[PDB]
Ligand binder design. Structure first.
Ligand SMILES: c1cc(N2CCC(N3CCCC3)CC2)ccc1CCN1CCCC1
Ligand SMILES: c1cc(N2CCC(N3CCCC3)CC2)ccc1CCN1CCCC1
Lengths: 307, 307
């Protein structure tokens, strides 16, 4: 099976590699991770929480991570250059809380003892990975609940690591938190909802009858994020019918031959060639899980042909 | 394509219809629901919340429900006899709160006005569907977080409809709530964790250093559920290699030819014939989404053959 041939047969073009951001395109590195190495990492379903993780599988430029002491059902795939993994010791060095393995309490855990207990090694620092901005921990803003994207709500930046920061919805469960960057289309400076005739969702258990950002910021002794820090996402250039390689959301070990079925400002609707259209789904055009044609061959990862 | 033949070729037996509970087996009714009818129903991701719903699709004995005013991305399939759908007016008749469509406030909503606005009809009462027990709203108990099943926690029965009741985790987000029955393997009478040397998770922001059910029940002026009400789930008889019809979790419009790959006391691991084993997954053996061979043919629903 060959992309060049397939592209000729289908009279179609590949999405140009140059439209993909660096985290999506060909890596300029081999995958050094080995099964059994241990590291720290963000829980994708509880994104404020850093956890103890073990590399459970290696495939091309991707690794499958396991939360020590928890069920394999929670195992997740990231790319070898993911931003939300960190070497052993990072939490302590950076002042962050590390959630211990299932069955330990914090006071029973540290890395030196745990590595001896497991007869295991930390993933070397050398395997892991700037542009300044006006976002600081503590600042408040208006953000889309990614799980319920019609709702825009009062949020706070609660953590920050280099160019990414963490959005939390004041008085809402942690599980709604997510990491993003200054250009995210999901975040808005205070009083953006006013200026656009949109409903701002206010914190549970609050003066909802006439809520005020000014009063709230004083009552919480907090600054707003400055409008100048909110940078603008330039549109992606992806076009319908262009082909690419996509991680199958529904079984993420596989990467599949895919087609751009539809677009909007910041997303593409992917379609797995050979499969029914009812499998198609939306994904951010900057996702690390979509790739230029040839990414699998270049990285050593198997590619699923059309069904 | 024919089950009888396939079963001969594969030298396999169907799971006996008689091992399936009434909500899984052949219905003794046609599907009267029509596209466009409106009703009330529980939100599967927010199970304490009753919502305004419209029938968006009809297929065999199943219906696909749409949350008025919200994205189609939230559409969900139930069986025509589901317990958690209700006719127009039920919430008001039963004293429950009805969440209005996206874009209405409660005070702007009632059914008579809304049906005139939409030029639409309620699903007749005749389309909708006893065994006494000692569970009452307000009672407390110990329950498994179904999303994090290693954790057993302080919970409260917060709602009750005939034989089902709703479990809520005290001081935790509503999204963790779920409906169940008196025989659920996920619920336990107070001090079951003591009697089994298990850690009870206590409510956020509580005397965790030496938590007491007795003190807590007085401080909340609440009764415990009596041990006598906790009935016992008899094991299912499903055996490996037996065949059945299963709703595809990952694309629930489809029902597929399936095989029991593994079992435990209350679950079966289903496998879609023709597909890679990495698609297999666990499901409660009493789920309304698994069915006896021939269920699709009897009900008018298409059946996906093996890949
Ligand atoms: C249930 C839950 C919610 N919310 C969940 C919480 C949500 N966010 C939590 C983080 C900021 C706001 C705010 C809205 C809104 C409406 C419902 C009931 C209607 N269903 C929700 C999706 C399908 C319809
Ligand atoms: C994150 C969240 C939680 N919880 C989420 C809340 C949960 N339940 C809420 C309803 C009752 C208890 C209690 C445990 C536990 C551990 C973590 C971090 C570790 N990851 C969780 C699943 C994979 C590892």
């Amino acid at each position: 099976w060959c992309w060049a041939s397939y592209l000729e047969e289908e009279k179609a073009v590949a999405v140009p590699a140059k439209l993909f951001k660096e985290h999506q395109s060909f890596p300029y590195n081999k995958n050094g991770f080995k099964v059994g190495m241990k590291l720290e990492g963000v829980d994708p379903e509880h994104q404020s929480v850093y956890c103890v993780l073990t590399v459970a599988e290696v495939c091309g430029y991707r690794i499958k991570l396991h939360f020590d002491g928890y069920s394999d059902c929670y195992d997740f795939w990231v790319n070898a250059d993911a931003l939300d993994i960190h070497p052993v010791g990072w939490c302590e060095k950076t002042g962050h809380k590390l959630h211990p393995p299932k069955g330990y309490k914090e006071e029973e855990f540290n890395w030196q003892t745990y590595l001896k207990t497991c007869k295991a090694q930390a993933a070397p620092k050398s395997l892991f990975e700037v542009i300044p901005s006006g976002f600081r921990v503590g600042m408040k803003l208006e953000a889309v609940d990614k799980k319920n994207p019609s709702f825009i709500c009062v949020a706070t930046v609660t953590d920050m690591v280099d160019n990414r920061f963490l959005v939390h919805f004041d008085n809402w469960d942690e599980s709604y938190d997510y990491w993003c960057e200054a250009s995210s289309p999901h975040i808005h400076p205070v009083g953006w909802c006013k200026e656009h005739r949109r409903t701002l969702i206010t914190p549970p258990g609050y003066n909802v009858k006439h809520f005020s950002w000014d009063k709230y910021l004083e009552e919480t002794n907090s600054l707003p994020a400055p409008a100048r820090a909110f940078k603008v996402k330039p549109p992606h250039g992806f076009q319908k019918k262009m082909k690419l390689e996509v991680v199958d959301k529904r079984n993420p070990m596989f990467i599949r031959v895919a087609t751009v079925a539809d677009t909007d400002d910041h997303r593409v609707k992917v379609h797995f060639d050979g499969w029914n259209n009812c499998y198609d789904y939306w994904i951010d055009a900057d996702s690390p899980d979509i790739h230029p044609v040839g990414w699998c061959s270049k990285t050593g990862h198997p590619l699923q042909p059309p069904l």
